[PDB]
Design a protein around this ligand. Structure first.
Ligand code: IAA
Ligand code: IAA
Ligand code: IAA
Ligand code: IAA
Ligand code: IAA
Ligand code: IAA
Ligand code: PLP
Ligand code: PLP
Lengths: 809, 809
């Protein structure tokens, strides 16, 4: 059908069709008389998977032969989403499969909707890991993703009575055709026990053993025949109060990989979580060393191995590597430390204090006794270095310590990561600067060379070609397909900004995507949006720092203005807000209820008509993002300046033809810089402004007293206007806004609504709105994760990316 | 190589080889450079499995078309063993696969040893279910086996310091290529809750729901292209104190199918066990009704459905069927009961009281409130019938009640089964008679027509062709292959009893099997047996009623006689005893220690030499039975008369060329009757003799006082002769033998040792020993499970067996 989807060869389609029928018969064990859509989905999945194996085997065989430097990306989250379409795209099999299934009388799009999302992540951090895997394979790097195979991923969100209800994400129920279990490569992981000091070295004895069983998933590069591996570990009890009970208690050990902690940017110091963190680190490091000893002088270890820590979650890799080198390999401390530092690199994802991992000493003491001793030794030697560089600066010593004193002694994992890594990077320029100027200022002064910036990016395969084929096609028509793996080429679209044909096509694609999504909304969930309105969307995890509340205030403002002057014309809008709240985050759960409550009033007010709709997008996840983003007109990126490290959803919207209303926070700054501030809807306080307000002291009452419209809104919330049966339902929200709002919602309210008016004004001019859209798409090239990975490769890992096709399958 | 293994066609081998390589590549995802023996085993397994699917699909499709009466065999145990070789045998693919793997440079026998046994059974009862499945498919019956998919089967037995150590049987670790998960057919099962009495009928509400997910395994008939199904249910928690904990607690529901209770002929009234029993019944009955409504007048239900209860374990099927018909389908009680009785049939497996299931009322009350009410109603109406037939016989009423009064009220499941079944059968003639004369005398008098006999049998495919190809071949040479599915034809071998060539061949095969096993003993376990000695073996579960102890006494007697007259000639013997003890059965565990202790003394006594060896066969299971039975010379079947209902191991030994020393118990009686008492080594008390002794009162002291050799043995045990470091180690054993031996070991001692002397005398005459062997093999035809199933079909289920090949694959 469309060019960018590949060729539908005669031999190819014929081959696909027979293998499809072969799997239906031999793999699913059903004949055409009783097969269901799900059976057809699996037959297709196995058929596509078959095309990967050959390339997967030779790619890995190739790394064994040439022995390049290996990149190990450790993350407790890999937010993969669906795999079928992505695999077809990267293998140039989409049109062929579409034709093959068409000839078999099946609709491939219907089959793709059957696949369960691999939701092994919470949001930004986990999706970044996923885009990175795609880019590393596309750039020909010998990269390995290592994580945990949770049998239950991020919970499925249900909305009941306007409230969020959580239910288990049993994503493996029908099986996972993409993974390959490798029970023969199971490795032991140790917990508890005690430390014995023998004649020659320390010994970790009397430990509890838990087995780590690996499941490998193929990660195909974009049309280069490279297929890397993502290895996820699963917990298994060894086989060695009653026989029955002993067998039943095996589940205690297997609970380690049972479920993903559903927290986004929040630290919950539970023992089970600590076990998960060590579990992934311990098993992964054995693979690394194993693989290294094959390719005993560990002096070349840093030349053959690079370990990237996605946040501090896998920080135990540092003392675990030291434990292995010192206790097992018997290297001297200084030698082991030199190796460790040159091998590890740490990526920070946020500056919010509640997100920082600070594990209680008593926990590490019981669970990992040897690691705590190693950590104390690292701290001791590190502080001696600070003391020597800043003689007499005693406060500096306590500020930089890995050991945090107080109520209960805690270990600051971020400090541990900085001390044990040769590189530390923020995820957006402004974020990286904030790290050097505040949170890690002391460390930056001691070792300035370690601090870097690596602005986040998103993969254009999944976030353009896959989710928005229509847009990818009209772009390809003018500049070719080369931009798919070289996004900077999108610049060339700048010379079409005045081309009447292109303007019309860009607007047509957006219109089609909106009709498509408007339909999906009714098919599933039975709603009523109007395709002609401006699609205003804010999708991301529910957080106070994200400020879904500021958006809510604007919505209520629009509603009140309409009720004040009913027969006045206003640009129609469909405001969509979606995102999950961590189960224990009370305020976040209240915000969801507020959104639905506003919708209940606004969506049934006769005077409003179809001029304003408020919809809460249920169960926001990767597959849903692939549907709503291509249909968006306005992207809401309104976090308080200095709180959103980077953001990546913002980049997805930019690449898909939506204009952005946002604060100068995270990557928004670089996006506006790339497209030009005139083509962005920037408003609100800058980081400096927030600091000034904090010096002075934030008093929300002031804004309430001087802004009539804002006062009216708070009084509506307080009096029960949005909760008739429960008049004080939103008391906590008002109380927070009025007395303890860390994110200063009121301070940006006036500038925000004024900016929104400018958005409505531009939307009334279709031609100019679209021309601004073209300028955003044309300058979104920098935000490709291929650029990001190329920078990590050259500036941190010391390896050169390659765009060379691997010697066929 | 050997005729009976099929043809090795040119096209067949070529096809097998490429599919083998296809699976290695696409299924195992490995190339020849790194594949291990286990990978090769799986490639072969998937290749063989592929040959089944076509036949499996058409067989099931066929039953849907013709709609024959369905046979449902419910059992909590299916002791399947390995599946690879059995599948090849039944598909006539053994020689082809042997050649194909040979050409690929692999040894198929080495690959077969890699397969894990499907040990979902304890012993006799579970193996019987397995042989039955094979026979039902071979006889073309539309039969379905229904059970539980335990993730942990019978424990693997390790011997440490002479003691049994149990370790988890993680048989699914590397996967099961034979099963097909069918998550789409998952069904709900209810527990707990309460009963509500509404205007029109009772309601079972507020229940806890557990999901039953089916896994289907193909059961191929012998070369008739019929492939039936064995459906095993797995417990799954539904998806609807903390979010994390809620997810973690899902395992509470999934524990239902976690492990097999390792008890053989012993009732342990644990709640988890009761849950397993209802779980299998509830899910299975929904399938049955589902399937019936397709093929609403339930009057034809008994004409389209037959439910066979393997022991009382699935007895809840009776009140569950009533619950469904009365509460859900709304049929009147009497109609529902008529249907239930005509549908259900019950098979009793033992008369020992400790094996009888008697569930406490308070347990059923809490777990299954509606079923208890139904049981009370059944009892009420049943007792009214007894009262009407035996007016005034008040003691009869309490003896026949399903409700047993006393300390704690209990429900006698055996009485429940008899009342709700149209047929009740014992498993051997003597056992069936004992049921009518004692245990169920009252029921037999009330309904004589219900009681039947169905002597057990074993499948000649697994127990002859598969485990003893050498013997199957020399038999086929003289009489053809027709006997494989018509064992009675073995009679024809009677005319070869004087044939010198046959005598020589029969003896040669036995010699080869012994050399083979003697080697296996050294490869694995490093032992020292001498292939020239008489192989005396007793393999079966360790039980006091089985009398491994009587065997031990004989062994010690032989040892003492040798020490008394060292330079006297005695027929060399290798005494092998193997079997597992239930973890909580103390005496059984002590018996294992005694056996190993005897071996420690006897196997290292210089004066004994290689004239006497005592070996304990570790981890006895189906795959091990397939190795040792073909190598046996003497089969020990020495249970106390009236305790072993049938036995099946006895039949396996007879078919494989071993002579039998045994008591007139269970099927031993019919075996001796078939071969002729002169060709059997019968000894000991008969059932009548045991009763006479019980009237009088058993006093072991008497035998101890009048038998010098017996006294010497007891004194050796008592003084620590077999346990130097622990002089009183076997005090419990001596105490039991002397004061509370329910099985009267001493009473059969003299006749047993005297009989053993006759065995040694015959063994000294190779020619005559073999001629007697031929007469046993020639008359073992009656013990084929094909005969047994044919009888169940005609006399209980009302269906005719067929030997017609299904219309090709
Ligand atoms: O278990 C049953 O009640 C039916 O099992 N049926 C099948 C069945 C059972 C087990 C394995 C494969 C298998 N295929 C089956 C079928 C198929 O492929 N097409 C049809 C059409 C109508 C009825 C049944 C089938
Ligand atoms: O095509 C269909 O609608 C159903 O095909 N169903 C089955 C089916 C088709 C093909 C192979 C096996 C097979 N088993 C099947 C079922 C089973 O085991 N239990 C149930 C309960 C309700 C509906 C269907 C089934
Ligand atoms: O004050 C409290 O007791 C909890 O404040 N909690 C949070 C909280 C406060 C302020 C900003 C963000 C934030 N996230 C929070 C949580 C989160 O993301 N997940 C959980 C789980 C259990 C309790 C709390 C949380
Ligand atoms: O992960 C690794 O360290 C190696 O992964 N290797 C393989 C590998 C990884 C994942 C899927 C398939 C796969 N096949 C692989 C190989 C194969 O088929 N033959 C060889 C020979 C030497 C090294 C490796 C292989
Ligand atoms: O052929 C061999 O002896 C080993 O092949 N090994 C592997 C291997 C072969 C083919 C595909 C994937 C693959 N992964 C492999 C391994 C892995 O993931 N971890 C270990 C640890 C120690 C030895 C081997 C492995
Ligand atoms: O007297 C006792 O406390 C136990 O007697 N137990 C048994 C027992 C006594 C006499 C004959 C057979 C027999 N089997 C027995 C058991 C068996 O097979 N499994 C278990 C598990 C836990 C306790 C006991 C048993
Ligand atoms: C890209 C993405 C995110 C991150 O969005 P932000 O707005 O940067 O927080 C979160 N969830 C999903 C499902 C995503 O696709
Ligand atoms: C046949 C068999 C049994 C039953 O043997 P008996 O001597 O009748 O108790 C038990 N276990 C296994 C593994 C068997 O093959």
């Amino acid at each position: 059908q469309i060019s960018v989807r590949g060729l539908a060869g005669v031999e190819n389609v014929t081959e696909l069709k027979k293998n499809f029928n072969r799997h239906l018969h031999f793999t699913l064990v059903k004949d055409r008389n009783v097969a269901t859509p799900r059976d057809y989905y699996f037959a297709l999945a196995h058929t596509v998977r078959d095309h990967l194996v050959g390339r997967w085997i030779r790619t890995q065989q190739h790394y064994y032969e040439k022995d390049p430097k290996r990149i190990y990306y450790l993350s407790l989250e890999f937010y993969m989403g669906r795999t079928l379409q992505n695999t077809m795209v990267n293998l140039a099999l989409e049109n062929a499969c579409d034709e093959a299934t068409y000839q078999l009388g099946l609709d491939m799009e219907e089959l793709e909707e059957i696949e369960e999302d691999a939701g092994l992540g919470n949001g930004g951090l986990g999706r970044l890991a996923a885009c990175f895997l795609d880019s590393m394979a596309t750039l020909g790097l010998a990269a390995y993703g290592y994580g945990i195979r949770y049998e239950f991923g991020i919970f499925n969100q249900k909305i009941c009575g306007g409230w969020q209800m959580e239910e288990a994400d049993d994503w493996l129920r029908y099986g996972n055709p993409w993974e390959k279990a490798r029970p023969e490569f199971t490795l032991p992981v140790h917990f508890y026990g005690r430390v014995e000091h023998t004649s020659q070295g320390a010994k970790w004895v009397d430990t509890q053993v838990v087995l780590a069983m690996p499941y490998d998933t193929p990660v195909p590069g974009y049309r280069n025949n490279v297929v890397n591996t993502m290895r996820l570990w699963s917990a298994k009890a060894p086989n060695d109060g009653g026989y029955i009970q002993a067998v039943l208690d095996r589940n205690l050990a297997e609970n380690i990989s049972r479920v993903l902690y559903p927290n986004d940017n929040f630290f919950e110091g539970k023992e089970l979580r600590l076990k998960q963190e060590y579990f992934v680190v311990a098993a992964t490091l054995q693979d690394i060393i194993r693989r290294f000893k094959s390719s005993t002088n560990f002096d070349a270890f840093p030349d053959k191995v690079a370990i990237q820590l996605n946040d501090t979650h896998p920080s135990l890799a540092i003392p675990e590597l030291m434990r292995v080198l010192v206790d097992l390999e018997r290297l001297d401390w200084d030698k082991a430390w030199e190796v460790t530092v040159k091998t590890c690199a740490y990526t920070n994802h946020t500056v919010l204090p509640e997100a920082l991992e600070r594990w209680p000493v008593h926990l590490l003491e019981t669970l990992l006794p040897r690691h705590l001793q190693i950590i104390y030794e690292i701290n001791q030697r590190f502080l001696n270095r600070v003391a020597a560089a800043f003689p007499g600066d005693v406060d500096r010593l306590r500020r930089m310590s890995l050991v945090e004193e107080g109520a209960v002694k805690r270990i600051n994992m971020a400090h541990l990561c900085i001390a044990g890594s040769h590189a530390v990077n923020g995820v957006a320029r402004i974020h990286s600067e904030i790290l050097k100027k505040t949170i890690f200022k002391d460390f930056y002064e001691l070792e300035p060379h370690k601090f870097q910036n690596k602005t986040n990016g998103i993969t254009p395969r999944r976030w353009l070609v896959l989710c928005n084929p229509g847009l990818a096609e009209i772009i390809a028509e003018r500049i070719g397909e080369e931009y798919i793996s070289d996004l900077d080429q999108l610049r060339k679209l700048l010379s079409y900004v005045d081309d009447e044909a292109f303007i019309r096509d860009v607007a047509k694609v957006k219109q089609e995507n909106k009709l498509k999504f408007a339909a999906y909304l009714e098919r599933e969930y039975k709603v009523h949006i109007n395709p002609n309105s401006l699609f205003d969307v804010q999708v991301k995890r529910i957080h106070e720092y994200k400020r879904q509340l500021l958006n809510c205030l604007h919505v209520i403002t629009l509603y009140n203005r309409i009720k004040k002057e009913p027969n006045k014309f206003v640009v129609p809008r469909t405001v969509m807000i979606g995102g999950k709240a961590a189960p224990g985050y009370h305020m976040a759960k209240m915000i969801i209820k507020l959104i639905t409550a506003i919708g209940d009033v606004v969506n049934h007010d006769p005077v409003v008509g179809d001029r304003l709709r408020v919809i809460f997008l249920e169960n926001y996840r990767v597959s849903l993002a692939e549907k709503v983003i291509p249909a968006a007109d306005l992207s809401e990126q309104i976090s308080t300046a200095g709180t959103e490290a980077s953001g990546t959803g913002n980049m997805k919207f930019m690449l898909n033809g939506a204009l952005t209303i946002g604060t100068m926070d995270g990557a928004n700054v670089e996006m506006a810089e790339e497209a030009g501030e005139e083509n962005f809807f920037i408003f609100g306080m800058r980081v400096e402004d927030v600091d000034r307000l904090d010096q002075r002291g934030y008093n929300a009452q002031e804004y309430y007293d001087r802004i009539p419209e804002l006062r009216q809104i708070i009084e509506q919330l307080s009096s029960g206007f949005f909760s008739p049966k429960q008049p004080d339902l939103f008391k906590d929200i008002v109380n927070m806004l009025m007395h303890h709002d860390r994110f200063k919602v009121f301070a940006d309210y006036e500038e925000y609504v004024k900016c929104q008016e400018r958005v409505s004004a531009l939307y009334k001019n279709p031609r100019e709105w679209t021309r601004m859209v073209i300028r955003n798409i044309a300058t979104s090239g920098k935000f490709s994760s291929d650029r990001t990975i190329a920078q990590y490769a050259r500036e941190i890992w010391g390896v050169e990316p390659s765009r060379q096709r691997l010697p066929a399958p």
